[PDB]
Structures are given as structure tokens and as C-alpha cells.
Amino acid sequence: ALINPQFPYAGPVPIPGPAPTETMPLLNYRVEGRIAGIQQARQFMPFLQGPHRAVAEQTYHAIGTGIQMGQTFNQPLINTQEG
């Protein structure tokens, strides 16, 4: 702010002001609020809580069976070298 003498800035907005209204009042709000609809315990989703496999491992079962059977052919006898 600058004040300049001799033209000085009025020393106030004075008493000639026009009170325009008495509408100043905010009427307090008084209220009762009830949000009470029956609630049912459940919601349907496509899927909740699953941690789906991105790849599975290979998996398997097992079997064996049979017996011990055989047809054989042997090497001929040979002269013994030494000993």
C-alpha cells in the first residue's frame, strides 16, 4: 500500500455503506437417516480366490507287469590258453 499526501486514502470505508440484506442465516439442518434394507449373505462372481495354473507339470500313473522268461544261444567252448 501507498498513501499519498495531500491526496490521502480515505481512512476507512465509512458509515455511508448500504446494508443490503439481513439474509445471513443458515438454518441448521435437522435430519434422521435410515439405510435398512435386508442384506443377504452372498454375492455371485465368476471367480474369486483362485490362483489358476499358468502351466501344469507333466503328471502320470504307473504300471508294470510280467514274468522272467527267455530263449538263449551260448558261445562255443574254446581251448584254454594259460593257467
Partner: protein, 56 residues
């Protein structure tokens, strides 16, 4: 005999103990199957190479 009174009487026990152990070891093997070929279907049986013999 000149036998001291010390270690050697311990030594006699040790000798006896060693001999008993050896005999048990010698006799302690079960009369059994330890020679192997425990595959009951083994009438052919040739584990190495061709041309073999059973008595000189």
C-alpha cells in the same frame, strides 16, 4: 618265564579276544547265498564275452 605283572596280562586277554573274533568271523558268515546270481530266471546266464568254459 619272567612275566611282568603289567601290560602283557592285558595282552593275553587281547590275544584271546582277537583269536575268538577271528574264529567267529570265519564261522560267522551265514551259510547262505552270498555267491549272488539271485535272479531266479537265470538258466542261460552269460555276463561277459563269448567263448567260456566250465572245467579245464
Amino acid at each position: 618265564m619272567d612275566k611282568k605283572k603289567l601290560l602283557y596280562w592285558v595282552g593275553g586277554g587281547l590275544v584271546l579276544i582277537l583269536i575268538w573274533l577271528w574264529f567267529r568271523n570265519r564261522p560267522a558268515a551265514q551259510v547262505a547265498s552270498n555267491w549272488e546270481g539271485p535272479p531266479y530266471m537265470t538258466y542261460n546266464q552269460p555276463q561277459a564275452g563269448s567263448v567260456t568254459l566250465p572245467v579245464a
